[PDB]
């Protein structure tokens, strides 16, 4: 997350923090997640493409801090991981960058709601906000593209949706971008998502309820002019979701 500000997990209670064990007991933050159902988290498949083994990932809800434990947070294993069949990335762009994780705690419980722990509203077929609308993104991603550490407290920041006709442009990302994808940047490019923010939520206020209209997927820079972020547009995966999502 470039620009932005630090938040507590409460401003963003649907966020999920995904860790991978390197073995030894060694864990590292991999990707962000959004909790869409009390037993289901959704992310990007690139986050796990190289190490698909499920018995190997860890999800934390209600976690606002990275290596200190928040109060109220719950820990889960991964009952199942499902990457999108037609996931491709022979190029800058990812395609179909969408993954689901089935979580369950050591006590067998799925996710219990609270002020820390909330689900996120999926969009609906035709409810994508206007271009120029202001959604928020959040995560532990780096705070400068040339940086070594990850910020230890969660961040958030607000970007404005960009029309697909606009970032299909030469100066932008030309043919690299499809209509199953959704661009979004600051208008003076002062703030964006960065490495680490992958798999986290693009959230918009829709008819009141907070909603998950995008997933952090890819972009060229971290907040360069004419080089926005890019998101999996969740409306175009509602069947795939639905299909896989039930189980």
């Amino acid at each position: 997350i470039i620009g932005g500000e630090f938040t507590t997990i409460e401003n963003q209670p649907w966020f999920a923090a995904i860790y991978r064990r390197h073995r030894g007991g060694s864990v590292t933050y991999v990707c962000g997640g959004s909790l869409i159902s009390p037993c289901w988290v959704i992310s990007a498949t690139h986050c796990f493409i190289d190490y698909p083994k499920k018995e190997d990932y860890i999800v934390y809800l209600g976690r606002s801090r990275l290596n200190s434990n928040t109060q109220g947070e719950m820990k889960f294993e991964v009952e199942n991981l499902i990457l999108h069949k037609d996931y491709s990335a022979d190029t800058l762009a990812h395609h179909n960058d969408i993954a689901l994780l089935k979580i369950r705690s050591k006590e067998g419980r799925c996710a219990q709601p609270s002020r820390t722990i909330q689900t996120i509203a999926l969009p609906s077929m035709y409810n994508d906000p206007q271009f120029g609308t202001s959604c928020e993104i959040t995560g532990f991603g780096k705070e400068q593209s040339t940086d070594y550490l990850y910020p230890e407290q969660l961040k958030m920041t607000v970007v404005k949706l960009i029309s697909h006709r606009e970032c299909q442009q030469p100066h932008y990302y030309g043919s690299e971008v499809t209509t199953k994808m959704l661009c979004a940047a600051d208008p003076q490019w002062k703030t964006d998502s960065c490495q680490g923010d992958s798999g986290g939520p693009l959230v918009c206020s829709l008819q009141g309820r907070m909603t998950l209209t995008g997933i952090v997927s890819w972009g060229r820079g971290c907040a360069l002019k004419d080089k926005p972020g890019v998101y999996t547009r969740v409306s175009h995966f509602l069947p795939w979701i639905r299909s896989h999502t039930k189980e």
Partner: antibody, heavy 114, light 112 residues
Framework: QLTQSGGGLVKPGRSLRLSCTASGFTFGDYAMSWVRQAPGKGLEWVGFVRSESAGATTEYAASVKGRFTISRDDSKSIAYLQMNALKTEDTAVYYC???????WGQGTLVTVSS | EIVLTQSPLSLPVTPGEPASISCRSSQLMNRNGNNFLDWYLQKPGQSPQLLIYLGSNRAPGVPDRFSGSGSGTDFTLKISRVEAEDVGVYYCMARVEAPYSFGQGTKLEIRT
């Protein structure tokens, strides 16, 4: 993995279609790249076709965007680089590439000569 | 679009000594850390083979003596210790976006 057929001698201004038959992997899951060399000098990248899952759009290089086009046929699992108005400066050994970069072929020298 | 100049163009080495070529560009990162610069070697014969992909990941089967490194605009390939078989031209390549492009090449000449 990638046998390059087609090619040879052609007169300037004339055309030609280099094909490339693939095996051992799923052809539909990959972009297909093409890179030239031209005897004595280094590599120029020339174009690609996207996976199809990604829209099978094509990018080209500055030199060739006018003349060259580059196709695919998931069915027969081939990629094809059709070169149209052919310039003598187009003489090179042309490799099929698979992916961005994964597995080059052996290429086929095209020589454009009277 | 992106122009790479690699240095040096020829480079003589005694097998068992380490070599180091360096590609200098002007662009290049994505949002997951990876720089989109690859290293090939064309062995005498023909047909380039990919050595390092994505800046620092060694392609499969590529021996352990090769190493991807760099950041920003300055990337460099490294052989801990040359071998007879490593003779060739090395090409670095930029594939962040838009049109792709190569360097001019580096000719590693290697003996009693």
């Amino acid at each position: 993995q990638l046998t390059q057929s087609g090619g040879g001698l052609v007169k300037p201004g004339r055309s030609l279609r280099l094909s490339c038959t693939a095996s051992g992997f799923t052809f539909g899951d990959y972009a297909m790249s093409w890179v030239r060399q031209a005897p004595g000098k280094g590599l120029e990248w020339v174009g690609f076709v996207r996976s199809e899952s990604a829209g099978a759009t094509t990018e080209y290089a500055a030199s060739v965007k006018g003349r060259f086009t580059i196709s695919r046929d998931d069915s027969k699992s081939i990629a094809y680089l059709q070169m149209n108005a052919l310039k003598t400066e187009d003489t090179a050994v042309y490799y099929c590439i698979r992916g961005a970069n994964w597995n080059w072929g052996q290429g086929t020298l095209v020589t454009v000569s009277s | 679009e992106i122009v790479l100049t690699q240095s040096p163009l020829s480079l003589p080495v005694t097998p068992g000594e380490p070599a180091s070529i360096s590609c200098r560009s002007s662009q290049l990162m994505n949002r997951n850390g990876n720089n989109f610069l690859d290293w090939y070697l064309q062995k005498p014969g023909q047909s380039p083979q990919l050595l390092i992909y994505l800046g620092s990941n060694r392609a499969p089967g590529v021996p352990d003596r090769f190493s991807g490194s760099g950041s920003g605009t300055d990337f460099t390939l490294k052989i801990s210790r040359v071998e007879a078989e490593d003779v060739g031209v090395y090409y670095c390549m930029a594939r962040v976006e838009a049109p792709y492009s190569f360097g001019q090449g580096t000719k590693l000449e290697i003996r009693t």
